[PDB]
Amino acid sequence: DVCKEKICSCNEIEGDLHVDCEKKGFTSLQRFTAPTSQFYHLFLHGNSLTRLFPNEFANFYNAVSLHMENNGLHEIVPGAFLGLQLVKRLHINNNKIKSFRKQTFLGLDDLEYLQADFNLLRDIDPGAFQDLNKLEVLILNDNLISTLPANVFQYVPITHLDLRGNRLKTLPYEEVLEQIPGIAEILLEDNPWDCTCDLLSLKEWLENIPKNALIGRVVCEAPTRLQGKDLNETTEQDLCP
Amino acid sequence: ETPPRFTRTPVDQTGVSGGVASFICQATGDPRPKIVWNKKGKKVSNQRFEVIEFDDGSGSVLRIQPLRTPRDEAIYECVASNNVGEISVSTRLTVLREDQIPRGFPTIDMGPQLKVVERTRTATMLCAASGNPDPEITWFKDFLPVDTSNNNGRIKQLRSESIGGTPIRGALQIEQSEESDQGKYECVATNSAGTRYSAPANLYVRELREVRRVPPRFSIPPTNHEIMPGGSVNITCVAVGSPMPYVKWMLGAEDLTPEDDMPIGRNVLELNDVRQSANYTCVAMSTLGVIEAIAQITVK
Ligand SMILES: *[C@@H]1O[C@H](CO)[C@@H](O)[C@H](O)[C@H]1NC(C)=O
Ligand SMILES: *[C@@H]1O[C@H](CO)[C@@H](O)[C@H](O)[C@H]1NC(C)=O
Numbered sequence: 001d002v003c004k005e006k007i008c009s010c011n012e013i014e015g016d017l018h019v020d021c022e023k024k025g026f027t028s029l030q031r032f033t034a035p036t037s038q039f040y041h042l043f044l045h046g047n048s049l050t051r052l053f054p055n056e057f058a059n060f061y062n063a064v065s066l067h068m069e070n071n072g073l074h075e076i077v078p079g080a081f082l083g084l085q086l087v088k089r090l091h092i093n094n095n096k097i098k099s100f101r102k103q104t105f106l107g108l109d110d111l112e113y114l115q116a117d118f119n120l121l122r123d124i125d126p127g128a129f130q131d132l133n134k135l136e137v138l139i140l141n142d143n144l145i146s147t148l149p150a151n152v153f154q155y156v157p158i159t160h161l162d163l164r165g166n167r168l169k170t171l172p173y174e175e176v177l178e179q180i181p182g183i184a185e186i187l188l189e190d191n192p193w194d195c196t197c198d199l200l201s202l203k204e205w206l207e208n209i210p211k212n213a214l215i216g217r218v219v220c221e222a223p224t225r226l227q228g229k230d231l232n233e234t235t236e237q238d239l240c241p
Numbered sequence: 242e243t244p245p246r247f248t249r250t251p252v253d254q255t256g257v258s259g260g261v262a263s264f265i266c267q268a269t270g271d272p273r274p275k276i277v278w279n280k281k282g283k284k285v286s287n288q289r290f291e292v293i294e295f296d297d298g299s300g301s302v303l304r305i306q307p308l309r310t311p312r313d314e315a316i317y318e319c320v321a322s323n324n325v326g327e328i329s330v331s332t333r334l335t336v337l338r339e340d341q342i343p344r345g346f347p348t349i350d351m352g353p354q355l356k357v358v359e360r361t362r363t364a365t366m367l368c369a370a371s372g373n374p375d376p377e378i379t380w381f382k383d384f385l386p387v388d389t390s391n392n393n394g395r396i397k398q399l400r401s402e403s404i405g406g407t408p409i410r411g412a413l414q415i416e417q418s419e420e421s422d423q424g425k426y427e428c429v430a431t432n433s434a435g436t437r438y439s440a441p442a443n444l445y446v447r448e449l450r451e452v453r454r455v456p457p458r459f460s461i462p463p464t465n466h467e468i469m470p471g472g473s474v475n476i477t478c479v480a481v482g483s484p485m486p487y488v489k490w491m492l493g494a495e496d497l498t499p500e501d502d503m504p505i506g507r508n509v510l511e512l513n514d515v516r517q518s519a520n521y522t523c524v525a526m527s528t529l530g531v532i533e534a535i536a537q538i539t540v541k
């Protein structure tokens with residue numbers, strides 16, 4: 001019914017119309033509507049949207065970017081984002097979403113920007129982003145990602161990959177690292193990197209990578225033989241004797 | 242009350258097939274001038290051009306992309322008009338095909354890349370151009386020229402002087418990143434020959450990554466050793482925390498590790514020809530504090 005229902009503050013500037021519904025205490029958005037002619041940036045910050053069910057945001061098809069952080073979100077039923085072809089930017093950080101499954105991001109065809117930092121994320125379905133073919137920037141810092149599945153970034157135009165602050169032991173070239181040639185910024189700092197035979201691929205890759213594309217350091221946390229040492233200056237013999 | 246007056250007028254430009262041409266025209270007056278772009282009389286009307294107005298309203302920019310020859314050529318007119326008056330300036334476009342490019346035409350050796358910057362930090366978009374005579378660098382954000390004027394501001398276009406037979410730089414430095422600053426940037430090299438554009442580069446602005454701060458802790462403490470006299474021992478000292486603390490080696494109050502290359506996180510001490518017993522003190526340092534641990538070296 002917003003905005004002529006006065007519920008949220010849809011002030012009309014600058015150059016874009018911002019629908020500020022931050023801290024209004026929304027629990028669902030199937031009961032609500034949004035303007036027909038104007039495109040808008042939707043802000044649903046601190047509203048306590050605990051669960052997203054199919055065909056929420058259905059009347060918000062004209063949204064260009066969705067920003068729903070600090071909602072304590074944990075459950076996303078597939079098709080919750082359905083209808084959001086226009087959206088280019090999705091903020092779902094600072095919640096409690098424990099995993100990415102396939103068809104989790106169903107509906108978001110144009111999506112270019114994804115932020116899911118601080119979410120206790122662990123498992124990520126291989127075919128989670130496989131339809132997000134415009135996803136240039138993926139930000140996943142401060143989570144519990146143990147591993148990245150084989151084909152996760154196949155045909156996903158990743159350019160910014162923020163993977164800091166996870167439980168990430170290794171990163172394979174085969175399928176995973178080869179499939180993202182277009183990187184310009186990658187962040188791997190704060191990970192328990194296990195420098196063994198399995199990390200060689202990373203090392204060599206970081207050599208062939210565009211210069212200054214890696215942001216931060218990749219320090220070996222293991223083994224104790226190598227703890228505290230940069231991958232930068234790690235002889236191949238030491239990784240793989 | 243007042244007539245219109247040109248504050249900035251478009252100048253003749255030479256572009257390349259499939260490239261970009263931009264003409265800037267802004268005026269002042271009361272009531273505010275209306276800017277019209279005419280192509281040899283009538284206003285331009287096609288599916289390749291685009292008029293992008295200033296947020297001021299002071300003027301606009303004619304954006305032709307991609308350049309087609311000889312179709313794009315040649316002359317255009319900027320007309321500023323209000324109730325009390327009207328004024329006009331003209332300018333010539335030239336678009337040369339791929340085999341008409343001179344030696345020393347502006348070329349972008351390295352353009353700007355995608356950039357996600359945390360808010361209130363520095364974001365410096367890079368560019369590197371080469372041409373004869375040497376190209377002058379200038380920037381466009383979202384189809385509009387970047388005001389890098391001399392008057393003090395965050396948005397400085399760096400001299401970034403690199404010497405010799407190297408390319409020109411001219412990087413765009415953005416201090417105190419804001420939500421306004423994010424958008425599509427484009428680098429532009431311009432000399433006598435003409436104008437070359439770089440591929441567009443998106444700038445994104447995010448929030449700062451909250452990092453929990455921790456004082457230094459010795460992950461690997463300096464161990465004690467007994468050695469045959471004149472032997473050589475290598476003691477490993479490793480400390481952790483956030484920010485990751487420097488690791489330094491001291492003998493008494495004497496500093497062994499040089500401040501210039503003080504290692505962050507890890508330091509191994511190499512003791513050669515030890516025929517004297519001594520205690521060596523490893524010291525970790527960060528803005529959250531300083532700690533130290535002893536490694537007792539005894540001689541057998
Ligand atoms: C280590 O890493 C960076 C390069 O990104 C820089 O500090 C330095 O050039 C490197 N040192 C080497 C490669 O020895
Ligand atoms: C320790 O000394 C040995 C000689 O025994 C040397 O080969 C090795 O490189 C040294 N360790 C270092 C420099 O970390």
Ligand SMILES: *[C@@H]1O[C@H](CO)[C@@H](O)[C@H](O)[C@H]1NC(C)=O
Nearest residue numbers: 518519520521535536537538
């Ligand atoms: C090292 O420390 C021990 C115990 O604190 C002490 O007995 C010994 O004299 C010390 N040796 C030195 C300072 O050379």
